[PDB]
Amino acid sequence: MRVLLIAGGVSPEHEVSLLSAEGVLRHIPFPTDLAVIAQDGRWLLGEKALTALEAKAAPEGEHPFPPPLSWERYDVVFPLLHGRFGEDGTVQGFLELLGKPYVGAGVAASALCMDKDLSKRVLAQAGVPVVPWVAVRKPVVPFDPPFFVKPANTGISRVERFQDLEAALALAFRYDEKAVVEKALSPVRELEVGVLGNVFGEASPVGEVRAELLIPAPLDPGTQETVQELALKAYKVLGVRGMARVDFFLAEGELYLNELNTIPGFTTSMYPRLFEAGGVAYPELLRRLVELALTHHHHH
Amino acid sequence: MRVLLIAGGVSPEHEVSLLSAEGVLRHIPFPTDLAVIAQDGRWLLGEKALTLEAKAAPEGEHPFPPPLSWERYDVVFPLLHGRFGEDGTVQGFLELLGKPYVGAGVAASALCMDKDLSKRVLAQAGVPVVPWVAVRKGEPPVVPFDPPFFVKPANTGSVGISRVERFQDLEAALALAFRYDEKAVVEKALSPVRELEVGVLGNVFGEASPVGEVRAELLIPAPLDPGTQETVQELALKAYKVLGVRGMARVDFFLAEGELYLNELNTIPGFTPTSMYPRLFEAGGVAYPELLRRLVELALTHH
Ligand SMILES: Nc1ncnc2c1ncn2[C@@H]1O[C@H](COP(=O)(O)OP(=O)(O)O)[C@@H](O)[C@H]1O
- Looking at ligand 1, which residue's alpha carbon is closest to its atom 13? A156
DSSP state of B70: G
Same domain flag for B14 and B73: yes
| Other C-beta atoms lying within 10 Å of the C-beta of residue B207 | 15
Helices (H) and strands (E) in chain A, counts: 9, 13
Find out whether A8 and A254 touch, Cβ atoms under 8 Å.
no
Helices (H) and strands (E) in chain B, counts: 9, 13
Measured distance CA(A133)–CA(A52) in Å, rounded: 40
- On chain B, the residues whose CB falls within 8 A of the CB of A112 are 107, 111, 117
- What is the CATH classification number for the domain harbouring B74? 3.40.50.20
Same domain flag for B71 and B140: no
b/e A142-167 (16+ beta carbons within 10 angstroms → b): eeebebbbbbbbbbeeebeeeeebee
Same domain flag for B13 and B51: yes
SS3 A36: strand
- Looking at ligand 1, which residue's alpha carbon is closest to its atom 27? A190
Domain boundaries, position B78: 3-110
Q: Would an 8 Å CB–CB cutoff place B180 in contact with chain A?
A: no
Experimental technique used?
X-ray
SS3 B90: helix
Pairing of strands B3-8, A213-214: unpaired
Tell me the H-state helices in A58-164: 90-97, 107-114, 118-125
User: Which H/E stretch holds residue A205?
Assistant: strand A202-209
Please identify, by atom number, the ligand 1 atom nearest to the C-alpha of residue A188: 4
Find out whether A183 and A131 touch, Cβ atoms under 8 Å.
yes
Same domain flag for B80 and B174: no
Stretch 207-266 of chain B: residues touching chain A, C-beta under 8 Å: 241-244
Same domain flag for B29 and B96: yes
Find out whether A199 and A236 touch, Cβ atoms under 8 Å.
yes
Find out whether A4 and A33 touch, Cβ atoms under 8 Å.
yes
Measured distance CA(B12)–CA(B81) in Å, rounded: 9
Same domain flag for B93 and B143: no
Q: How far is the CA of A180 from the centre of ligand 1 (A)?
A: 12
Question: What is the arrangement of strands in the sheet containing A213-214, beginning at the earlier edge strand?
Answer: A213-214, A202-209, A189-196, A243-250, A255-261
Pairing of strands B194-201, B149-153: unpaired
SS3 A292: helix
Tell me the H-state helices in chain B: 14-24, 46-50, 89-97, 106-113, 117-124, 170-177, 226-242, 276-282, 288-302
- Identify residues after which chain A is interrupted (C–N over 2.5 A): 138, 155, 210, 267
Closest C-alpha to A105, from B7, B103, B88, B62 = B88
Give phi and psi for A7, each to the nearest 5: -145, 170
Measured distance CA(A193)–CA(A217) in Å, rounded: 10
Q: Which residue of A has its CA nearest to B243?
A: A118
Please report, to the nearest 10 degrees, the dihedral formed by the alpha carbons of residues A118, A122, A125, A127 taken in order.
-120
Measured distance CA(A182)–CA(A247) in Å, rounded: 16
Measured distance CA(B139)–CA(A66) in Å, rounded: 39
Closest C-alpha to B85, from B202, B3, B6, B164 = B6
Burial (CB count <10 Å: 0-12, 13-18, 19+), residue A291: middle
Same domain flag for B68 and B33: yes
Name B118's Cβ contacts closer than 8 Å, sequence gap at least 6: B111, B112, B243, B264, B265
- Looking at ligand 1, which residue's alpha carbon is closest to its atom 15? A155
Q: Would an 8 Å CB–CB cutoff place B94 in contact with chain A?
A: no
Binding residues of B: 146-196, 252, 264, 266
Q: What is each CA distance from B82 to A53, B7, B184, B265, in whole angstroms? A: 39, 12, 16, 12
- HEC profile for B140-194? CCCCCCCCCEEEEECCCCCCCCEEECCHHHHHHHHHHHCCCCCEEEEEECCCCCE
Tell me the H-state helices in chain A: 14-27, 47-54, 90-97, 107-114, 118-125, 166-173, 221-237, 270-276, 282-299
Which amino acids bring their CB within 6 angstroms of ligand 1?
A: A 131, 148, 150, 154-156, 182-185, 188, 190, 247, 249, 258-259
